[PDB]
Every structure is written in C-alpha cells, then in structure tokens.
C-alpha cells in the first residue's frame, strides 16, 4: 500500500514548461523514482489537503 494522497482539489506546484502552476500529480508521501523532479513537483499543498488509501 502507498500512504500519501491529496484529494481535496488542493493546489500543488507542478512545473510544465518554464513555469510552475497549480496541478495534482504524484501527490504521494513515498518516493522511489523522480525524487529530484518530485521535489519541485511535490511541493506541499497550498490549500486544504486530505489523504486516502488508493492501495494501488
């Protein structure tokens, strides 16, 4: 099981091309790959964040 999910329509910093804008991607508290890119992508939320059990 993976612990870590953000499902409150919450905002996170995801960078597409030359800018970082609101979007929900990985949104997990565990990492095995893309750690250096995840840091920029996984900036903790701006707004209310609540976690669930995807169990994927």
């Amino acid at each position: 099981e993976v612990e870590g999910v953000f499902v409150r329509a919450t905002v996170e910093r995801r960078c597409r091309a030359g800018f970082c804008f609101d979007k929900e991607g990985q949104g997990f508290a565990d990492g095995v790959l893309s750690d250096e890119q995840l840091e920029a992508l996984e900036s903790d939320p701006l707004l209310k964040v609540e976690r669930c059990t995807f169990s994927g």
Partner: protein, 50 residues
C-alpha cells in the same frame, strides 16, 4: 512531508539491548551423578586392592 525518509533510518532507529545474553546454560547436573576429586598433578591414579 519529507523527500527521502529512506536514508534517515540510521539516525532514527534506537537500541534495545534486551535480546543480549537472554540465554543461559542448562542447570548443573554432574553433582548428582559425579563426585568431585580435587587434584594438583598431571595424571591422577586410583588404586584399590579388591
């Protein structure tokens, strides 16, 4: 959150030295079946005439 709790395992973990020496030998038994014969030589010999 934290980027890599993977590497921070060494610092977090503590020690519980409760399994150290948590064992002992079986209770002494030669006393019941054997008798002590203190000696100070290299080869003790016993003699009986029957």
């Amino acid at each position: 959150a934290i980027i890599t709790p993977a590497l921070i395992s060494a610092l977090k973990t503590s020690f519980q030295k409760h399994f150290q020496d948590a064992l002992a030998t079986a209770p002494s038994t030669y006393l019941q079946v054997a008798t002590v014969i203190p000696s100070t030589t290299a080869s003790n010999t016993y003699g009986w005439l029957g």
